[PDB]
């Protein structure tokens, strides 16, 4: 009669990160934007589609940059979240009870 | 033949019948530099 169950309750801090990127716009793009936002008989369709295509290209590049950098940040934090083998394995083997 | 030959996998053969009259020709590429998303705002 000496045995008894034991429980362990670990609680974690959640930490905090963020994201940010640069994305510039020219005034001519905004001007052609203004007519396309009210797309009607006027406003050259070819130029409007050219401008929107170019802007969408740049926007999707800078957007996919986020997913590109997520892997960078995660690999960095795991690299900062590891001890060396030559310092962990000897204790991992040479400690039967403590 | 050329295409069935294994070396042809290093070339992109395309027909250009109107070529003898070329004075001149240029082609353009628009490669851009990908950016890593540094998280903090600078």
């Amino acid at each position: 009669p000496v045995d008894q169950p034991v429980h362990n309750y670990m609680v974690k801090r959640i930490h905090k990160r963020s994201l940010s990127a640069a994305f510039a716009i020219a005034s001519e793009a905004l001007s052609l934007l203004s007519n396309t936002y009210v797309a009607a008989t006027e406003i050259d369709s070819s130029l409007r589609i050219r401008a929107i295509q170019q802007m969408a290209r740049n926007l999707r590049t800078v957007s996919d940059s986020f997913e590109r950098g997520t892997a960078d940040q995660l690999l960095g934090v795991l690299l900062e979240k590891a001890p060396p083998l030559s310092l962990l394995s000897p204790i991992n083997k040479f400690q039967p009870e403590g | 033949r050329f295409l069935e030959l294994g070396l042809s996998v290093a070339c992109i053969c395309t027909k250009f019948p109107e070529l003898a009259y070329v004075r001149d020709g240029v082609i353009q590429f628009e490669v851009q530099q990908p950016m890593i998303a540094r998280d903090g705002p600078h």
């Binding site: 396309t36 936002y37 797309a39 929107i52 290209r57 999707r60 | 001149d24 020709g25 240029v26 590429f29």
Partner: peptide, 21 residues
Amino acid sequence: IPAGIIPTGNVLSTIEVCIFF
């Protein structure tokens, strides 16, 4: 901008060959 287009998705840009005459 009213987009109304597919969100790019690996844009296949076009090679343009220019002829001088």
